[PDB]
Amino acid sequence: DLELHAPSYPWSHRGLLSSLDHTSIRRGFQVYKQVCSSCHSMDYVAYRHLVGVCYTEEEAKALAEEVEVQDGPNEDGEMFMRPGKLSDYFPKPYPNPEAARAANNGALPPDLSYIVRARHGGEDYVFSLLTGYCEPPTGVSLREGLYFNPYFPGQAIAMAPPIYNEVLEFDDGTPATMSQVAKDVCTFLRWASEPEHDHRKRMGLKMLMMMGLLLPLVYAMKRHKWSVLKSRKLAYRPP
């Protein structure tokens, strides 16, 4: 059965030397925190990772301090809840995978730290999925707790449409239309999959300029040494 593949969107980071828009990264973290995180985990991203990316240290510390985290046994050997801290990772919405599937209709919502890198199509795919919900076409019936997403493999997703217009409020006043929310969160997810994206592209620009100097000059070096061979003349003078 054929599948519907995501179109290519002109992400501001699509270009070869184009960085991410870090305001979109900040709005995307807001989307994840207020929308996805009730069911999705981001095990490999911590609050300290946000500093200098989308939030200042005081801001990210207050974001960490907004949640409560379980800390190692105390003197009595009891666990306890303490405010979050910058070195804490993003909270996990479920204690174990089984409770995660129990809170759904039996489906596991994936960890989102790598979801952009772990899917063919990446941000284009995630934007298409979040924006692509429609009523199934004639001849198609889905079980209870499944929803037709023409971009999801099988076209029957257990995730209900999570984003809609005014699903959250953005702190810069950015209108929270569904496509705006999806674009912001997909930017944030590309960052979460590749936190080295901007630095990698800056290093790529530097490598291209260094190579555009070194390759011609080392080529000139080789031809300086080799001109003795490339211009020499042979004469055969048999008796």
Binding site: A46, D71, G72, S87, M210, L213, L214, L217, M221, H224
Partner: protein, 110 residues
Amino acid sequence: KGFSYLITATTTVGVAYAAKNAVSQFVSSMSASADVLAMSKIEIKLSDIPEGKNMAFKWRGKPLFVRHRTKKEIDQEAAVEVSQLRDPQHDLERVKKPEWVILIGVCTHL
């Protein structure tokens, strides 16, 4: 000779730049990673610590003791002789800010 050796010297300058960046990255990888630099590295406390109260912490794996020894105790441990101690130490020298002594909390015997 100047044209040829100018080419060679500019080549060497660019190669030195590239080599320094590569070797610096490989050296820095062995330097403390961001998780190490964000864990026990530092832990700023707060005014939550009351007077003469051992608000305890878990920094560096070591339980940290933070008290607010109120006048007398400080003075008493100045009154506590140094020579009498097995490990000769001065109270004010031990606690740079007399009011609060900060000792890593763990017995130094088995």
